[PDB]
């Protein structure tokens, strides 16, 4: 062990002498390739999605540039990593979700959707014909009697619910930040949750971004329908953070 290799343990999803799966690992680095970072926070009455929106070109219809997807009307998500893979996974989520309601009679629980996408990826992890997807998925929405939910699933099969989390280049820096502010945790209101998310991203990227440099998605106990903030009202939050 200690970083050893044997056979093709570095080319296909088979065990290494240590009992690791390098391809699954190489799949994580693949996420960062996009150079972006994403954060999601769980308020007491809502859930928030925030990510960079690096649009270095003026030739792109900024409208078509997103990492925020509407899965259901009550389920929204944020992708981090290889794009094409991501759109793909988004489509599968939309599918598994539309199918769940048709087959069972009720909206799929954010809890279940993520467990599903997760289970799928697990296969790529055990089958050699294909590589895992180099992307990460964060879903959010309001459950029946569980209030707001925030889940994220791995290119490794892992999935879980969090008070808040991140993905992308500054994931590890974003966690240290959040988990430190979740202890001082004031009243996790809608504004604070949104505010806490923006800063976590701004300070780890040290940017104080304009309203066009980020995108924010939100789901509310009083407005369960997934909502993507306008550039206008995004700034309304930015200004609010500058008053101090």
């Amino acid at each position: 062990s200690r970083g050893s290799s044997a056979g093709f343990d570095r080319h296909i999803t088979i065990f290494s002498p240590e009992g690791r799966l390098y391809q699954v690992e190489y799949a994580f680095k693949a996420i960062n390739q996009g150079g972006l970072t994403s954060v999601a926070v769980r308020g007491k009455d809502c859930a928030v999605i925030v990510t960079q929106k690096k649009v270095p070109d003026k030739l792109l219809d900024s409208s078509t540039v997103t990492h925020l997807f509407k899965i259901t009307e009550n389920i929204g998500c944020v992708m981090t990593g290889m794009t094409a893979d991501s759109r793909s996974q988004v489509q599968r989520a939309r599918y598994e979700a539309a199918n769940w309601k048709y087959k069972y009679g009720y909206e799929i629980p954010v809890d279940m959707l993520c467990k599903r996408i997760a289970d799928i990826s697990q296969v790529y992890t055990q089958n050699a014909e294909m590589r895992p997807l180099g992307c990460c998925m964060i879903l959010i929405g309001i459950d029946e009697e569980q209030g707001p939910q925030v889940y994220k699933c791995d290119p490794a099969g892992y999935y879980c619910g969090f008070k808040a989390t991140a993905a992308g280049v500054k994931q590890t820096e974003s966690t240290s930040f959040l988990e430190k502010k979740v202890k001082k945790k004031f009243d996790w209101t809608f504004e604070q949750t949104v505010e806490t998310a923006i800063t976590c991203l701004s300070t780890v990227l040290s940017i104080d971004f304009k309203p066009s440099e980020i995108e924010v998605g939100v789901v509310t106990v009083e407005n369960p329908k997934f909502r993507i903030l306008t550039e206008a009202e995004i700034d309304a939050h930015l200004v609010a953070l500058a008053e101090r």
Binding site: G7, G19, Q126, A128, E129, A156, G157, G161, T165, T175
Partner: protein, 233 residues
């Protein structure tokens, strides 16, 4: 457009060993520890659920899963592989009940799932499951405790451990406890054998436990957990 690899990814080396299986076990020996005790009057399962990275919502996911009304599970190793086997065991559990109208005998559920795990050591295009399970059940009076690993081989234990320090965790139990132990008794000697490696502040969210008496299988709440924790309860 996808095809498929029809050749097996596990093959005997000249030493006669099945390399991928050993390596799978290595993924196990490197996983959060788990303990199982057959209290001749029930069985207990407990493992180190040390996620709670202050942001992780310990609730949303479990490691001690119910298969049937009277069966239960825990593992040591790769979490995602486990999940797959949980869905297959639960499924295998139903296919039995529909046919026989009697809940599936714990030994039988083990045999069936073990067969699956064995399947992934010979079928083409796949790697063995990087996990080991501890199945517990109350089938026909007597309580049962089993363990099946990557190879697809299983054994019945009076008690044991798997994962980190499973070597020490075993020897510890190899003496630090014995049969005739009643219910709550086996539970204590189990959470103890756990701490015999559990690095950190072992709280009620750092662990998860389930018990299987001759009256169904269930998971203990953070309450009943916080209790036994105070070195008693």
């Amino acid at each position: 457009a996808e095809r498929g690899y029809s050749f097996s990814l596990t093959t005997f080396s000249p030493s006669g060993k099945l390399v991928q299986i050993e390596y799978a076990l290595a993924a196990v020996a490197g996983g959060a520890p788990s303990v199982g005790i057959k209290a001749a009057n029930g069985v207990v399962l407990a493992t180190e659920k040390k996620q709670k990275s202050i942001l992780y919502d310990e609730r949303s996911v479990h490691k001690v899963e119910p298969i049937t009304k009277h069966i239960g599970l825990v593992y040591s190793g790769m979490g995602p592989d486990y999940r797959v086997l949980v869905h297959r065991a639960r499924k295998l559990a139903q296919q039995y009940y529909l046919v026989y109208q009697e809940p599936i005998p714990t030994a039988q559920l083990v045999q069936r799932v073990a067969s699956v795990m064995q399947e992934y050591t010979q079928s083409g295009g796949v790697r063995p499951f990087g996990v080991s399970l501890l199945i517990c059940g109350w089938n026909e009076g007597r309580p049962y405790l089993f363990q099946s690993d990557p190879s697809g081989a299983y054994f019945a234990w009076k008690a044991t451990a798997m994962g980190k320090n499973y070597v020490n965790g075993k020897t510890f139990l190899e003496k630090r406890y014995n049969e005739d132990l009643e219910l709550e008794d086996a539970i204590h000697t189990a959470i103890l054998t756990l701490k015999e490696s559990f690095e950190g502040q072992m709280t009620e969210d750092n662990i998860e436990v389930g018990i299987c008496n001759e009256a169904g299988f269930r998971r203990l709440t953070p309450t009943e957990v916080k209790d036994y924790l105070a070195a008693i309860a």
